[PDB]
Amino acid sequence: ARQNLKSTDRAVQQMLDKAKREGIQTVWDRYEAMKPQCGFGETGLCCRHCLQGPCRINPFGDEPKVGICGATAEVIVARGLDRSIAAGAAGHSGHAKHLAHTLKKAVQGKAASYMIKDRTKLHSIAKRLGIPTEGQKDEDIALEVAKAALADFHEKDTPVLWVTTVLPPSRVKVLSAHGLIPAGIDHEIAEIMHRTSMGCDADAQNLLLGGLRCSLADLAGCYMGTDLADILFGTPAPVVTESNLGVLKADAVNVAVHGHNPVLSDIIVSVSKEMENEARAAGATGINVVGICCTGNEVLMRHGIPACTHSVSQEMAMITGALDAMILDYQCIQPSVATIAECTGTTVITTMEMSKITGATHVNFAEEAAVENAKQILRLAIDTFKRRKGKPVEIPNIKTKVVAGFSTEAIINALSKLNANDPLKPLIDNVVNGNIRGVCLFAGCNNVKVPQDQNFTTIARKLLKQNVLVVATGCGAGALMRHGFMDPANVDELCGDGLKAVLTAIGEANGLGGPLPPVLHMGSCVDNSRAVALVAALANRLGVDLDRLPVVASAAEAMHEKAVALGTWAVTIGLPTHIGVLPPITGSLPVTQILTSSVKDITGGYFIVELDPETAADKLLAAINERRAGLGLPW
Amino acid sequence: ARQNLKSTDRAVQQMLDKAKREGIQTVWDRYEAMKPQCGFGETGLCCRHCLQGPCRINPFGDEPKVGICGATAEVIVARGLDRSIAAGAAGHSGHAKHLAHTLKKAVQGKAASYMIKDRTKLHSIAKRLGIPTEGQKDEDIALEVAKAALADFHEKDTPVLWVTTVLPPSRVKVLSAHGLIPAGIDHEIAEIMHRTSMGCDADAQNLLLGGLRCSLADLAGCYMGTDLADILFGTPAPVVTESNLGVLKADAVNVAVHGHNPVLSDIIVSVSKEMENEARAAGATGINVVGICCTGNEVLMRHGIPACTHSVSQEMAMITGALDAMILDYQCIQPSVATIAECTGTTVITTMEMSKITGATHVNFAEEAAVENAKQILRLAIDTFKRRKGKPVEIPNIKTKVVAGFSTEAIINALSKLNANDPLKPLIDNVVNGNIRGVCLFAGCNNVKVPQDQNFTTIARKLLKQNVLVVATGCGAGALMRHGFMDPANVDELCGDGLKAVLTAIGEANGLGGPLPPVLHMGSCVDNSRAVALVAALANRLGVDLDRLPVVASAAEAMHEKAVALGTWAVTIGLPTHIGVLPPITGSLPVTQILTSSVKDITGGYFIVELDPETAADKLLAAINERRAGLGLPW
Ligand code: SF4
Ligand code: SF4
Ligand code: FES
Ligand code: FES
Ligand SMILES: [Fe+2]
Ligand SMILES: [Fe+2]
């Protein structure tokens, strides 16, 4: 098998050869077994919203042409998309809610393993929300902030403040005029599920406006999740680490944190340091915590924990034979890990009541007992390391250097070395003079349909040569880090002269003797909210709305319902938004036209659906350059 | 075409012949055009929860055997079912929320068309919730009740009170021990959507326990909806009216209220009386308001408005040519009505922001302007009546007599004529002595897959001959009313001797000179909560839990996601629950076994999946008789 048709990651290719030798089925094998996939589902022309279904509609030809209840193709496609947006929002609802409850418990004395680590961020959030700080104890300000977070999940006398207080007033006014501001996060999720149920909303424009509103409930949960995680665990600052399977160490207890929530992984990191002698008594050098997916990004950004792998290739970390434990909370975990564990020795451990996998070991993890729960979990890992005394392992000797930790606060601080009292101005100056053509955010998943990382790297290379400032989160950041895009040594090879000049000027002012890295890692998927904060701050400084800025987004290999919600709120806040896999919309030309064209007249953003990455890069550059022209700039 | 293969309703058959002559496509034609339907969807073996899909699994044979991410058949089936339960709960969330906001506005002086009509019910609800009434103004008690209703949608320091205060403590304890009490209505909906999204919950038992909990959030919304509608519009008492298409009148302005919420239909009823002279000036005898679906049930139960038709046959009311307006809010409205209106003359009017249909006229309906909005709507209806001056219409001369209005309060009052201070005892006495074998609730929809009404009438006939007390709601009540099961003149033909003796004794004590009807109509689908209140009161009076009572439920022709949620909470509160159409579970034997067997060990209820109605009746009788035996009674 030509493994570069499956992944462009050479460590993943090596593990794919090992999996094939050993007869271990992978995600790529399960994909091949699924082909050809159902074209009704691929196009969006299938509905199972009642027990008269399944209903399908032929994309072309003869009957069936309409659902049994009379639902048209437009209605069926829009309802399916809306449910995907609601499901993404629900994942960020649970994540943010988790952190809100943890902060509340911490300041009520009920969870002593947690505390206010970033007091400055706590006070700035309180100020943004309108919560008074003068004369108040930190623990009382934090209680108020946690209560406000919980209140945004339901209707109240204000709209969702993690929308209205984080976008410029001009953008809030545009959205309010179209009825798009969410009333409550879980309120919107429930209204979507209602209006898309049988015999309810059946007008594509009305349905899609509901979808835009629910996508802003997802943005709110992301921004809430970042705000709360920064309070509890610290705002990221620049860090240096490594990525790819070579960060595993045959002689250590290798423990992957995988899933999403730092409430769990951050404690694993600190406890693992305390249990080092306990690990050495078992014959290991220590506990080697490594990251997979977003929770790996969280501990990479805050602590420099090296990233082992991401998304589609997560099983490969197990195939090395050296992964002693995989510690899970929720989201983006292939349930195949539980069965592969049987073959690879790995102990897969779930920790959250609503996210169990048959055949995994479950260790309930309560914030009230976090340290005790973490020691129980890590002792299972040490037990597993001892069982592989004497077995060979195959860890590919492949890793990259990763400079990361570029929270919005960190970026503003780095820029402030060039202009202390007007930190955004050096960035804007270089946009205006052409040294920075625009900004592109790469975000979202890998997807087995796309050779892993190929779209992220192909599009990133073309944009960097054209002097685009590239930022990245989630498994987009994972794709770019595993291919060297976060190593400043690659600036000369990857970047246009103008962008290199800017990256070098900023880095030298930060005492680096070298540039910032080619791509700025802004964190996890909830940390797409950080990109929003940066873009909104640039909008505010310029006095224009986000739909006038030369800023675009690319979910180049999207997979999860969260990525659909992300793409939709990127459009709703005003960005040209590329998606590099087909969402289930092509069976309705009216819906496609709304999402790629007429929504421009509502929010100023729009989707760019393009599966060829070189063409996608051209289209993203055209969108950036159209925004430049609209500001009167050369391009 | 043999129209009795489509519907057992003879008025519907006549309209099917008219539709065929005129070339108007119906729901049955769209069903035929859909056959054969997709077997992956029929069995539940399809997943579209991420953009790597669609994934399918062959029920038998070779690959594909597992989803791309590793999701097994058990996980895929359970996740799809859970989303259907969440969607049903969301429909009842929106309905109940609507009423809560209306009550709040009414007592805040913001909606003068609405008021506290049932002060006794207001005070009993407040007492059940723990809200003090002594020394308080009604408007303040009502504000507190509305605030408590809204609070149950989100997490707080108590669980959902419209669950914990409406079931016996012993049942609440059983549910709490299994972690099944909902924390908040919209909270549970969002948690379902999260845990069923890609890479989250992947254990069938864990997923299904989440589904049971979310089904109790649906029960809460139903019970909240009934409680609030009774406060605002009056608790039903016995009423006499008629049903079927013959209630339309060629010489009147015929206006159907269709959908769910009495906030709209109840005002239509009162305003239509005030506009009678305005209608006579246009040449009509008056405005003839008729009911379709649940909102028709609501105004039938409270005002005796005749029911025109239900569920699957709703288009047929338009085919008569005499339907001048169809006034819609949300749920169970076939969107085909908007296109059929073009051919039939009918003015289809939507009124709710989240439920529009392309091609219908939209008239926003604000509770603050209810009377003004209703007059605008009814004036469109009068305009339409005038346009059919001189056209022939074909109204089948087919109707039945319907005695209805059996709220739980009404049933208790009727029984109190036999035992004033212990009203449930005469019912229990007749259960014990065999005159009443048990109780069966028929509920839920019609479904185009089943000849309309055939399962409801076939099963009801067999149970009535075996002396089962039969109660009904929703389109189950609609099916039974359109076939004469709500006419006391049919008691001798339909009922066993024991049941006839009881129905006659109760009716004679109520001054009727005749029995109660063969089937007691307990109202709309939210009014399945009334059946809960009756059964819980019987449990309390006997000192046993609901899973010991000889009470069963039958969703004999289920369709909507709401009906899946209903069947699941009937199981969760302890009832043997028949479903007469295949839910998408047969592709997983483990899930089927949980839902039909091992859940007995958790909640004491269980599903009975049986598509043959004579066999279903036997199985329901066996379940009733097993409960009789468990109480030591003859059967
Ligand atoms: S909602 Fe309409 S289109 Fe969807 S399954 Fe039911 S009948 Fe078919
Ligand atoms: S969640 Fe798993 S099973 Fe479902 S579509 Fe995605 S890959 Fe397939
Ligand atoms: S027909 Fe294949 S996704 Fe439904
Ligand atoms: S394959 Fe037909 S419902 Fe998906
Ligand atoms: Fe993620
Ligand atoms: Fe209904």
Q: Is B52 in the pocket of ligand 2 (CB under 6 A)?
A: yes
Question: What angle, 0 to 180 degrees and rounded to 10, lies between the N-to-C axes of helices B497-509 and B408-416?
Answer: 80
Q: Are residues B302 and B422 in the same domain?
A: no
Q: How was this structure determined?
A: X-ray
Question: Do residues B40 and B461 make contact, with C-beta atoms less than 8 angstroms apart?
Answer: no
Q: Are residues A279 and A329 in the same domain?
A: yes
Distance CA B539, CA A330 (A): 40
Q: Is residue B18 part of a domain?
A: no
**Beta-carbon count within 10 A of A281 CB:** 10
Preceding peptide of A36 cis, ω within 30°: yes
Residue of B42, B194, B337 lying closest to A93 (CB–CB): B194
Preceding peptide of B423 cis, ω within 30°: no
Burial B188-207 (b: 16+ CB within 10 A, else e): bbbbbbbbbbbbbbbbbbbb
**Among all chains, which residue has been given the structure tokens 């400032």?**
A469
Distance CA A346, CA A338 (A): 9
Q: Are residues A127 and A212 in the same domain?
A: yes
Determine whether B600 is exposed, middle or buried from the number of CB atoms within 10 Å of its CB (0-12, 13-18, 19+).
middle
H-run or E-run covering B324: strand B323-328
Distance CA A155, CA A158 (A): 8
Domain limit, last residue, from A236, A258, A273: A236
Query: For B11, which DSSP code?
Result: H
- In angstroms, how far is CA A336 from the centroid of its own chain? 22
Q: Are residues A289 and A435 in the same domain?
A: no
- In angstroms, how far is CA A52 from the centroid of its own chain? 37
In a 3-state reduction of DSSP, which class is residue A202?
Answer: strand
Q: Is residue B558 part of a domain?
A: yes
Annotate B478-513 with DSSP letters as a single string.
HHHHHTTTT-GGGHHHHS-HHHHHHHHHHHHHTT-S
Q: List residues bridging with B361 in a β-sheet.
A: B349
In a 3-state reduction of DSSP, which class is residue A237?
Answer: coil
Q: Are residues A256 and A215 in the same domain?
A: no
In a 3-state reduction of DSSP, which class is residue A197?
Answer: coil
B291-B295-B296 Cα angle (round to 5): 20
Radius of gyration for chain A, computed over Cα atoms and rounded to the nearest angstrom: 24
Which residues in chain A have their CB less than 8 angstroms from residue B53's CB?
37, 41
Q: Provide the sign of the torsion angle of the four alpha carbons B547, B548, B551, B556, taken in this order.
A: positive
Q: Is residue A14 part of a domain?
A: no
Distance CA A515, CA B175 (A): 60
Distance CA B491, CA B484 (A): 10
Domain limit, last residue, from A384, A405, A426: A405
Query: For B291, which DSSP code?
Result: E
Beta-strand ranges (E) seen in A131-261 are 239-243, 253-258
Q: Are residues A390 and A414 in the same domain?
A: no
Q: Is residue B16 part of a domain?
A: no
Q: A486: Cβ–Cβ under 8 A, 6 or more apart, which residues? A: A243, A400, A401, A402, A403, A404, A477, A480, A517, A518, A519, A521
Give the count of alpha carbons within 13 A of B421, CB side only: 0
How many helices and strands (H and E) does chain B possess? 27, 16
Distance CA B44, CA B332 (A): 22
Q: Are residues A301 and A345 in the same domain?
A: yes
Distance CA A534, CA A420 (A): 17
**Among all chains, which residue has been given the structure tokens 């270089």?**
A430
Radius of gyration for chain B, computed over Cα atoms and rounded to the nearest angstrom: 24
CA distances from A614 to A90, A474, A606, A609 (A): 34, 22, 19, 13
**Gapped junctions in chain B, after residues (C–N > 2.5 Å):** none
Contacts by B31-40 with C-beta closer than 8 Å and gap 24+? B31/A52, B31/A68, B31/B448, B31/B449, B33/A63, B33/A64, B33/A65, B34/A55, B34/A56, B34/A63, B34/A64, B34/A68, B37/A53, B37/A54, B37/A55, B37/A56, B38/A40, B38/A46, B38/A54, B38/A56, B40/A38, B40/A54, B40/B587
**Among all chains, which residue has been given the structure tokens 């960097």?**
A464
Q: Are residues B194 and B278 in the same domain?
A: no
Q: Is A50 on the interface with B (CB under 8 A)?
A: yes
Q: If we measure between CA atoms, which residue out of B595, B588, B609 comes closest to residue B208?
A: B595
Domain limit, last residue, from A354, A371, A405: A405
Question: Do residues A113 and A148 make contact, with C-beta atoms less than 8 angstroms apart?
Answer: no
Distance CA B499, CA B490 (A): 13
**Beta-carbon count within 10 A of A212 CB:** 25
* Dmax (CA) of chain A: 72
CA distances from B382 to B265, B373, B379, B521, B625 (A): 17, 15, 5, 32, 55
- Domain total in chain A: 3
**Residue set of the binding site of A for [4Fe-4S] cluster:** 38, 46-47, 50, 55, 69
Distance CA B197, CA A189 (A): 13
Q: B351: Cβ–Cβ under 8 A, 6 or more apart, which residues? A: B264, B327, B328, B329, B362, B363, B364, B365, B373, B377
H-run or E-run covering A146: helix A138-151
Question: What angle, 0 to 180 degrees and rounded to 10, lies between the N-to-C axes of helices A408-416 and A497-509?
Answer: 80
Q: φ and ψ at B197, to 5 degrees?
A: -70, 165
Question: Do residues A257 and A295 make contact, with C-beta atoms less than 8 angstroms apart?
Answer: yes
Distance CA B406, CA B523 (A): 7
Q: Are residues A86 and A166 in the same domain?
A: yes
Determine whether B64 is exposed, middle or buried from the number of CB atoms within 10 Å of its CB (0-12, 13-18, 19+).
buried
Distance CA B120, CA B345 (A): 44
Residue type, B346: T
Where in the sequence is the domain holding B383, given as residue range(s)?
A: 237-405
Residue of B80, B338, B354 lying closest to A210 (CB–CB): B354
Q: Is A65 in the pocket of ligand 1 (CB under 6 A)?
A: no
Q: Is residue B372 part of a domain?
A: yes
In a 3-state reduction of DSSP, which class is residue B310?
Answer: coil
SS (H, E, C) A271-303: HHHHCHHHHHHCCCCCEEEEEEHHHHHHHHHHH
Q: If we measure between CA atoms, which residue out of B529, B221, B335 comes closest to residue A195?
A: B335
Q: Are residues B390 and B442 in the same domain?
A: no
Which residues in chain B have their CB less than 8 angstroms from residue A67's CB?
30
Scanning B527-566 for CB atoms below 8 A from A yields: 558-564
Resolution in A: 1.4
**Among all chains, which residue has been given the structure tokens 């212990």?**
B422
Q: If we measure between CA atoms, which residue out of B300, B303, B308 comes closest to residue B324?
A: B308
Beta-strand ranges (E) seen in B333-474 are 347-350, 361-362, 400-404, 439-442, 469-473
Interface test with A, best of B77, B92, B194 (most A CBs within 10 A): B194
Burial B333-346 (b: 16+ CB within 10 A, else e): bbbbbbbbbeebbb
Query: Which is the closest atom of ligand 2 to the Cα of B198?
Result: 1
Question: Do residues B72 and A335 make contact, with C-beta atoms less than 8 angstroms apart?
Answer: yes
Distance CA B436, CA B439 (A): 8
Burial B521-547 (b: 16+ CB within 10 A, else e): bbbbbbbbbbbbbbbbbbbeeeeebbb
Distance CA A148, CA A362 (A): 32
Q: B96: Cβ–Cβ under 8 A, 6 or more apart, which residues? A: B149, B185, B220, B221, B222, B224, B225, B228, B526
Q: How many residues does chain B have?
A: 635
Q: Are residues B181 and B69 in the same domain?
A: yes
Distance CA B378, CA B386 (A): 13
Q: Are residues B175 and B205 in the same domain?
A: yes
**Among all chains, which residue has been given the structure tokens 């909240």?**
B224
* Dmax (CA) of chain B: 72
Which two structure tokens, joined as six digits, stand for A599?
């929504």
Q: Provide the sign of the torsion angle of the four alpha carbons A13, A14, A20, A23, taken in this order.
A: negative
Residues with CB under 5 A from ligand 5 (ion): A 294, 525
Annotate A316-347 with DSSP letters as a single string.
HHHHTS-EEEEEE-SSS--THHHHHHHHH--E
Question: Do residues A453 and A446 make contact, with C-beta atoms less than 8 angstroms apart?
Answer: yes
Determine whether B169 is exposed, middle or buried from the number of CB atoms within 10 Å of its CB (0-12, 13-18, 19+).
exposed
Question: Do residues A103 and A144 make contact, with C-beta atoms less than 8 angstroms apart?
Answer: no
Q: Is residue B30 part of a domain?
A: no
Which two structure tokens, joined as six digits, stand for B623?
């379940």
Distance CA B603, CA B178 (A): 9
Q: Is residue B506 part of a domain?
A: yes
Q: Are strands A347-350 and A323-328 parallel, antiparallel or unpaired?
A: parallel
Q: If we measure between CA atoms, which residue out of B269, B310, B305, B273 comes closest to residue B290?
A: B305
Distance CA A87, CA A192 (A): 10
Q: Is residue A427 part of a domain?
A: yes
- In angstroms, how far is CA A348 from the centroid of its own chain? 23
Scanning A433-472 for CB atoms below 8 A from B yields: 447-449
Which two structure tokens, joined as six digits, stand for B589?
């034997």
Q: List residues bridging with B560 in a β-sheet.
A: A50
Outline where B321-369 has alpha helix (H).
336-344
Residue type, A574: G
Q: φ and ψ at A542, to 5 degrees?
A: -85, -15
Q: B406: Cβ–Cβ under 8 A, 6 or more apart, which residues? A: B236, B238, B414, B471, B520, B521, B522
